[PDB]
Enzyme design. Structure first.
Site, PDB file in Angstrom:
ATOM      1  N   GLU A 139       0.765  -1.242   0.000  1.00  0.00           N
ATOM      2  CA  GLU A 139       0.000   0.000   0.000  1.00  0.00           C
ATOM      3  C   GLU A 139       0.796   1.292   0.000  1.00  0.00           C
ATOM      4  OE1 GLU A 139      -3.509   0.469  -0.237  1.00  0.00           O
ATOM      5  OE2 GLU A 139      -3.194  -1.574  -0.966  1.00  0.00           O
ATOM      6  N   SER A 140       1.876   1.347   0.770  1.00  0.00           N
ATOM      7  CA  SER A 140       2.652   2.574   0.870  1.00  0.00           C
ATOM      8  C   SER A 140       4.162   2.369   0.927  1.00  0.00           C
ATOM      9  CB  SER A 140       2.217   3.322   2.131  1.00  0.00           C
ATOM     10  OG  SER A 140       2.439   2.516   3.284  1.00  0.00           O
TER      11      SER A 140
END
Ligand code: NI
EC number: 4.2.2.n1
Length: 268
Positions: free
Chosen positions: A123-124
């Site tokens: 996700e990040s």
């Protein structure tokens, strides 16, 4: 103040039921007013405790839960696991710095840290501040403003956070991980009922990607079937994964294998 937040809360009465009555009972128990296991139904046990609680606090004691009664609860309740008990990671964008955090979160929520790590990575890439340029998605778990707000009101108190109007706490790794694990819990809970298997990270990522409802049908919808057919909104939202380079629709298995591979790149 806490009065503005209680101001937008639903005004509850004996007879109501739902997430609100559920948040109420939790707060009452967390205030020292035992109503029992929260079920989401405002009955007599809840009514008598509301009244007493109101009398003990000099509020209009008629059993009605409005702004003032809500603000008082938000003011007196004792958070069973304040997010400050979860340590901050020594550094950002670091999988190693994120490890101790996810361990604490696993102890707190029960969700395996390997899983939390895989998700925060896909996700990040471990940047708990990253803000998608194409949406609201912010922090380690890239929470949208909508879903974040929902998660705060339904699990927030549990960790000492009633509201985050700005949605600014999505930049705090501790609270994002806690909320992230709660989200995963709901999803693995919805998927296991219909799956002769414990949901895998890939199964849970699909739920995280397309929503728990979307993934539930998908994870059980004919291997060699055309995905875009059954999942139009999803297919129109991510054509790159639902359609081949020539525009033709991929099979379910192809979409799965494609996803499982995206996840695989972030395990261990
Ligand atoms: Ni009131």
């Amino acid at each position: 103040h806490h009065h503005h937040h209680g101001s937008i809360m639903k005004v509850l009465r004996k007879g109501d039921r739902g997430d609100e009555v559920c948040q109420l009972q939790t707060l009452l128990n967390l205030c020292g007013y035992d109503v029992g296991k929260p079920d989401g139904i405002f009955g007599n046990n809840t009514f008598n405790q509301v009244v007493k609680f109101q009398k003990d606090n000099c509020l209009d004691s008629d059993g009605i839960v409005g702004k003032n009664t809500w603000a008082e609860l938000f003011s007196k309740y004792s958070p069973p696991i304040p997010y400050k008990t979860i340590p901050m990671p020594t550094a950002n964008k670091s999988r190693a710095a994120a490890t101790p955090v996810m361990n604490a979160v696993e102890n707190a929520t029960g969700v395996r840290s390997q899983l939390l790590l895989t998700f925060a990575s896909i996700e990040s890439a471990f940047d708990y501040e990253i803000k998608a340029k194409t949406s609201s998605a912010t922090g380690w778990f890239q929470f949208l403003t909508g879903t974040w707000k929902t998660m705060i009101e339904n699990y927030g108190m549990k960790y000492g956070v009633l509201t985050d109007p700005t949605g600014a706490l999505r930049k705090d790794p501790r609270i994002s991980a806690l909320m992230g694990a709660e989200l995963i819990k709901e999803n693995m809970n919805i998927l296991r009922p219909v799956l002769k298997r414990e949901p895998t990270d890939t199964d849970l990522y699909l739920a995280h990607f397309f929503g728990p409802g979307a993934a539930r049908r998908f994870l059980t919808t004919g291997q060699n079937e055309l995905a875009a057919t059954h999942f139009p909104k999803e297919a129109q939202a991510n054509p790159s994964i639902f359609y081949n380079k020539d525009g033709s629709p991929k099979t379910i298995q192809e979409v799965y294998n494609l996803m499982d591979g995206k996840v695989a790149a972030h395990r261990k």
